[PDB]
Amino acid sequence: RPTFYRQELNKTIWEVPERYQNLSPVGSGAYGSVCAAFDTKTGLRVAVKKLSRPFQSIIHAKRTYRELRLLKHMKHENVIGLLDVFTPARSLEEFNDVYLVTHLMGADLNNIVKCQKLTDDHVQFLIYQILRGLKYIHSADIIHRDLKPSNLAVNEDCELKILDFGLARHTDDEMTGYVATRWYRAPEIMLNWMHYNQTVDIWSVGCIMAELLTGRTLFPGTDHIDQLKLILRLVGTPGAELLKKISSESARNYIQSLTQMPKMNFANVFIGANPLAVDLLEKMLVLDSDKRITAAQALAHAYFAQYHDPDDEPVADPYDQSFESRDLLIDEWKSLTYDEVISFVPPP
Ligand SMILES: NC(=O)Cc1cccc(-n2[nH]c(-c3cccs3)c/c2=N\C(=O)Nc2cccc(Cl)c2Cl)c1
Numbered sequence: 001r002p003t004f005y006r007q008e009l010n011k012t013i014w015e016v017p018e019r020y021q022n023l024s025p026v027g028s029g030a031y032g033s034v035c036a037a038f039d040t041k042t043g044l045r046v047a048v049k050k051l052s053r054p055f056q057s058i059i060h061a062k063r064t065y066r067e068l069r070l071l072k073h074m075k076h077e078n079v080i081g082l083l084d085v086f087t088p089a090r091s092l093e094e095f096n097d098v099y100l101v102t103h104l105m106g107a108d109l110n111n112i113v114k115c116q117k118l119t120d121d122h123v124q125f126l127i128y129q130i131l132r133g134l135k136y137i138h139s140a141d142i143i144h145r146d147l148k149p150s151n152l153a154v155n156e157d158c159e160l161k162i163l164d165f166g167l168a169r170h171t172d173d174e175m176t177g178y179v180a181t182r183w184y185r186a187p188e189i190m191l192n193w194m195h196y197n198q199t200v201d202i203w204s205v206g207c208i209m210a211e212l213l214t215g216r217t218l219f220p221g222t223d224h225i226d227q228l229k230l231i232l233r234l235v236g237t238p239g240a241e242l243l244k245k246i247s248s249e250s251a252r253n254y255i256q257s258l259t260q261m262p263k264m265n266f267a268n269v270f271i272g273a274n275p276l277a278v279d280l281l282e283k284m285l286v287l288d289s290d291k292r293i294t295a296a297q298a299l300a301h302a303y304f305a306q307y308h309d310p311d312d313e314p315v316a317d318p319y320d321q322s323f324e325s326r327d328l329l330i331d332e333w334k335s336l337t338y339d340e341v342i343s344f345v346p347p348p
Pocket residue numbers: 034047048049063064066067070071074079080100101102137142143144162163164165166
């Protein structure tokens with residue numbers, strides 16, 4: 001057990017092993033806060049997330065267990081991995097705080113798409129890495145659900161990691177209006193159409209790819225309805241085959257009220273794009289989620305010929321998500337979490 005030292009940072013008490021030096025706040029939110037620090041043991045610049053009251057409710061306790069499980073499992077070049085996890089607590093009785101340590105990310109993909117001039121080769125490499133990371137996440141039946149530029153860490157070498165930097169609740173207010181929180185969402189998830197699957201993430205990748213190509217938000221709707229309209233205008237209104245799959249009668253009924261519209265010519269939307277980019281976009285941005293290209297399928301697409309390597313695009317180890325269907329008490333979620341903290345083994 002290392003020695004821990006205390007330090008207040010924005011009215012938060014931080015109690016961290018001594019190996020973590022020079023803590024500087026980089027983000028705050030209802031679910032936690034993050035600091036940059038220097039890890040004297042590895043020489044790495046790190047991010048350290050302190051979870052805010054991780055066991056105050058059942059939903060909180062399960063969310064803390066969930067993140068930990070996720071993070072302990074992710075071992076891929078293009079996905080955030082866990083360097084360390086710690087608590088000041090000496091026992092389960094003491095246990096009330098959880099800190100997570102990952103590699104520090106300077107820039108997100110936002111601090112790239114704005115002003116920084118992107119070649120088609122850069123778009124190729126960036127999206128390739130997103131897809132390579134997604135293949136791995138989806139192989140474990142893990143769905144990101146919230147892919148967007150701010151959830152993608154990118155270094156000076158254009159190397160990329162998927163993460164989820166959400167410190168916030170994800171409320172109705174947060175999904176409302178002219179907001180980037182909603183711009184990358186698959187329609188079926190944005191509007192609660194049906195039970196969704198992992199292709200929600202492919203929709204997001206399409207929105208991201210478009211924006212990288214044009215330097216502009218693909219669907220910057222001023223609200224849910226306006227956004228739907230932006231979408232339908234590009235990809236066309238649904239036919240009867242798709243309407244059947246909208247299991248929400250009220251959703252179905254509204255979407256039938258709309259003037260029918262054909263799918264547009266993408267060559268005329270993405271003027272001057274590599275035709276292979278255009279092609280790939282048309283296969284990502286399909287209304288019917290059963291017919292979207294998958295991550296595995298898209299890696300083999302001609303657009304990525306320069307990067308694609310089937311012997312170096314690995315799948316995940318099996319991920320037991322049976323806890324998700326389980327009904328536990330706070331104390332039980334907490335002991336589960338405690339066990340996972342105790343048993344962490346750092347990477348090589
Ligand atoms: N969703 C929940 O209820 C649990 C829940 C709540 C909050 C975040 C997350 N997820 N999900 C993923 C994924 C990566 C790939 C596919 S999903 C990663 C992740 N956490 C971070 O990246 N943290 C993180 C981000 C920046 C700095 C530091 Cl230090 C940390 Cl720790 C799980």
